[PDB]
Structure 1
Amino acid sequence: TPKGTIYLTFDDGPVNASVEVIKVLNQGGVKATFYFNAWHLDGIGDENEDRALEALKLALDSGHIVGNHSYDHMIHNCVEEFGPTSGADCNATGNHQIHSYQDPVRDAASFEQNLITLEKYLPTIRSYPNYKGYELARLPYTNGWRVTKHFQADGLCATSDNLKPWEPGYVCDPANPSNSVKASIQVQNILANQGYQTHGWDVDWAPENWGIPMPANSLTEAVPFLAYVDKALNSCSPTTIEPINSKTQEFPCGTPLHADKVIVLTHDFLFEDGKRGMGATQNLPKLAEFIRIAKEAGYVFDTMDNYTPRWSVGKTYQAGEYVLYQGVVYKAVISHTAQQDWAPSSTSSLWTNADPATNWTLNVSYEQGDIVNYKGKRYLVSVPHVSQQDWTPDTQNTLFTALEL
């Protein structure tokens, strides 16, 4: 039985480099998750991306999971007017992490636009079970988390209102986060109410040095990176990770769903021979080696659609354990062995709804102090209870108290 589970996640695809990366994953006998920005398909993402559609098709046909990284990676907030050149413009200024989130509603809508463009270039995409663009997402620049009702946490210094995080004079106050960070929090919540889960990362496989020519060549080697993963295992990395803008300060250390698991973040473009260095030639062998020696050490590889285990007939669940079923998260009320007719639902007494959302819903175990949205108003939970059809916040003055607003 294994040491733990590693989840390879690649951000910022689909681009040309993605193709060889995928092939390498297949040769290594592993699946992975790709959080995509569909603007590359439109050829305006300022990358070698003529093979974008090919790379999307390949990822899906190979059984890899596809999740939502938003349409334009929030570049519409890096410029005054978004257009075909905006990607190039933002790379010129290098202001990706400045004012990255502004209008949380418009920024949230970016993910829905991502859905549209993906289904535009590949009309059959929803026929792929491993297509999870409508369920799994990750916020650009941000190590934030919306997994369960009690497993959520934000990147409180992910983005800035002023200076870049490395510029001298940059200041990060977790207790008084930037307006950009606040906006990104709002984005998290909006996605959660739309049924999305969002995940951050435990370690980042990145250049050891971004300041040199050909920075991609400095990607940590396989063995040492495996060391970093070992240390990450059950060590609440998100709180200790560097740099400061990659931290998840209020991460619920020791939360069950996170035990024995390490989420690896990396980027497709780091594996291409191009403007960032000899990524393909130097780094593809590293990816191949890492997978080989990780399996050898007792690790298994899995994808983000399973990070929360999917409910399955015949398996025994303990009271308090979480599962994922038909897009909804549930928490076991009593220990038992699942059978055909006993699946989690809005009326099941064996399970309660534990989505990381804030809209009032059926069969949720609400605690005192909880706040839910309903029919355009906010309501404070005054009495702990399990919600039901008749007990809507606007008719239950004992359970809920309307707020001003």
Structure 2
Amino acid sequence: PKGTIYLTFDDGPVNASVEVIKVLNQGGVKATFYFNAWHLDGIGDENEDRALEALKLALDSGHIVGNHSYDHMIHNCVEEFGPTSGADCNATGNHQIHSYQDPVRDAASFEQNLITLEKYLPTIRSYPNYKGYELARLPYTNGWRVTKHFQADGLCATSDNLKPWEPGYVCDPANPSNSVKASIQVQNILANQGYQTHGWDVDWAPENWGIPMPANSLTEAVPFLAYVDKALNSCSPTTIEPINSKTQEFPCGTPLHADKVIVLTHDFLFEDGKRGMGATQNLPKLAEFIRIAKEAGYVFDTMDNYTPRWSVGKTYQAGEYVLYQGVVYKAVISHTAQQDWAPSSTSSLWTNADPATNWTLNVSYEQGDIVNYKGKRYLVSVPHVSQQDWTPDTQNTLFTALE
């Protein structure tokens, strides 16, 4: 395979999601859907009466469902959140403005998302492809919490004053907006609940948002495949445009990102409706893209596999990463995986490399890491692998409490 494409669809489940999924199924591929459950409540200002149907269809078809927050942060676009808020924020177009404010409340939206999904589809946890409590992606934000050493933020994703295209708009990644700062804190809060978050490499979007029916200008399949070819092994989260889509400090060349392209797109771009004739014009682009991408040697996978599953029989090199039971591990020593020697909190063969900051067992801590433990912050003074006896409040040779 020349690479692996991860088709990721944001902002469903909506009516438009249904035909998208059928195109995927016909194409013989699985995708990842980052869902906002407010559509299930009928308050998301989309054609969304088939939201539940779409959710079930996504899950019955084997696609992965991940967590895009309950309301896409629309509570931070309006004065008081309610059933008309999506339409209000759509009226103003202030989505990217003050998008994150109180990061605790904003992170709680992701958990509210689990509540609502599990409300409308009480069986959802019986689906192994339901990953709502494991995989997430922040509204507006090309931000990543993949592993302890694969993390980076969208430093100008959202603004305190002006939308990006506007004159005089400033973006200083070194002194990011308050919204960006808050969004970083959300990332951290989620990572401490065990989420990975993933950004994207390429965004399948209207080439022109200024024309009527802008969804019609979704990149045609052939040139889109060119964009994908260009993103492959090219650290495109740093070079992608527009600016609010960049991940400025993305660890170019980080091993898990090799030979992979994450495509972001939006279900709503594939309906015939307020944005254009997206079903008529864009469903065949999706279909053709899948066909010609396969032809060209790409395979398609899902974000539960973006960090590969630990596999019995496979030989691992030290430093290689796996996902095992939702936790990221990094191989300590090269070896071949066998049945009883899975990664764990006590394995000598692996350390826990989750992208989290709370003190955790069997983590290779590095000098300069700051960890949280029983409500305090501690600076790691000497590198070591955490173990139960070496708690930060009792090991001042390893940790120093910060003020």
- CA–CA separation in structure 1 for the residues paired with 2:209 and 2:289: 22
- Per the TM alignment, residue 105 of structure 1 is displaced from its structure 2 partner at its CA by 0.1
- CA–CA separation in structure 1 for the residues paired with 2:385 and 2:50: 50
- Per the TM alignment, residue 168 of structure 1 is displaced from its structure 2 partner at its CA by 1.2
Match of 1:330 in 2: 329
- Per the TM alignment, residue 209 of structure 1 is displaced from its structure 2 partner at its CA by 0.3
Match of 1:113 in 2: 112
Q: Deviations over 1:166-212 (max 9, x none)?
A: 11121101111000000000000000000000000000000000011
Secondary structure of the 1:21 match is: helix
- CA–CA separation in structure 2 for the residues paired with 1:166 and 1:142: 17
% identical aligned pairs: 100
- CA–CA separation in structure 2 for the residues paired with 1:398 and 1:269: 54
Match of 2:11 in 1: 12
Q: Deviations over 1:45-84 (max 9, x none)?
A: 0000000000000000000000000000000000000001
Secondary structure of the 2:269 match is: helix
- CA–CA separation in structure 1 for the residues paired with 2:301 and 2:83: 36
- CA–CA separation in structure 2 for the residues paired with 1:268 and 1:20: 9
- Per the TM alignment, residue 310 of structure 1 is displaced from its structure 2 partner at its CA by 0.6
Secondary structure of the 2:118 match is: helix
Q: Deviations over 1:328-373 (max 9, x none)?
A: 1100011111111100000101101100000001011111111100
- CA–CA separation in structure 2 for the residues paired with 1:254 and 1:41: 39
- CA–CA separation in structure 2 for the residues paired with 1:190 and 1:184: 10
- CA–CA separation in structure 1 for the residues paired with 2:384 and 2:191: 22
- CA–CA separation in structure 2 for the residues paired with 1:19 and 1:231: 30
Match of 2:72 in 1: 73
- CA–CA separation in structure 1 for the residues paired with 2:396 and 2:367: 14
Segments of 5+ residues of structure 2 without an aligned counterpart are none
- CA–CA separation in structure 2 for the residues paired with 1:233 and 1:205: 15
- Per the TM alignment, residue 327 of structure 1 is displaced from its structure 2 partner at its CA by 1.2
- Per the TM alignment, residue 312 of structure 1 is displaced from its structure 2 partner at its CA by 1.1
Secondary structure of the 1:341 match is: helix
Q: TM-score, normalised by structure 1?
A: 0.99
Match of 2:354 in 1: 355
Secondary structure of the 2:106 match is: helix
Match of 1:88 in 2: 87
Runs ≥4 residues deviating over 4 A: none
Q: Deviations over 1:98-127 (max 9, x none)?
A: 000000000000000000000000000000
Q: TM-score, normalised by structure 2?
A: 1.00
- CA–CA separation in structure 1 for the residues paired with 2:208 and 2:19: 24
Q: Deviations over 1:225-245 (max 9, x none)?
A: 000100100000000000000
Match of 2:244 in 1: 245
The 5 A counterparts of 1:2-401 are: 2-401=1-400
Secondary structure of the 1:300 match is: strand
Secondary structure of the 1:210 match is: coil
- CA–CA separation in structure 2 for the residues paired with 1:260 and 1:123: 37
Segments of 5+ residues of structure 1 without an aligned counterpart are none
Secondary structure of the 1:345 match is: coil
- CA–CA separation in structure 2 for the residues paired with 1:291 and 1:57: 23
- Per the TM alignment, residue 295 of structure 1 is displaced from its structure 2 partner at its CA by 0.2
- CA–CA separation in structure 1 for the residues paired with 2:43 and 2:8: 23
- CA–CA separation in structure 1 for the residues paired with 2:259 and 2:364: 27
Secondary structure of the 2:367 match is: coil
Q: Deviations over 1:125-181 (max 9, x none)?
A: 000000000000000000000000000000000000000111112110111100000
Moved more, 353-362 or 165-174: 165-174
- CA–CA separation in structure 2 for the residues paired with 1:361 and 1:83: 38
Q: Deviations over 1:292-318 (max 9, x none)?
A: 000000000000000000111111111
- CA–CA separation in structure 1 for the residues paired with 2:123 and 2:179: 36
- Per the TM alignment, residue 249 of structure 1 is displaced from its structure 2 partner at its CA by 0.3
- CA–CA separation in structure 1 for the residues paired with 2:397 and 2:341: 32
- CA–CA separation in structure 1 for the residues paired with 2:277 and 2:122: 35
- CA–CA separation in structure 2 for the residues paired with 1:308 and 1:328: 10
- CA–CA separation in structure 2 for the residues paired with 1:127 and 1:213: 43
- Per the TM alignment, residue 94 of structure 1 is displaced from its structure 2 partner at its CA by 0.4
- Per the TM alignment, residue 255 of structure 1 is displaced from its structure 2 partner at its CA by 0.4
- CA–CA separation in structure 2 for the residues paired with 1:171 and 1:225: 30
Secondary structure of the 1:53 match is: helix
Secondary structure of the 1:13 match is: coil
- CA–CA separation in structure 2 for the residues paired with 1:199 and 1:391: 31
Secondary structure of the 2:293 match is: helix
- CA–CA separation in structure 2 for the residues paired with 1:59 and 1:327: 21
Secondary structure of the 2:45 match is: coil
- CA–CA separation in structure 2 for the residues paired with 1:337 and 1:382: 33
- CA–CA separation in structure 2 for the residues paired with 1:391 and 1:185: 28
Secondary structure of the 1:190 match is: helix
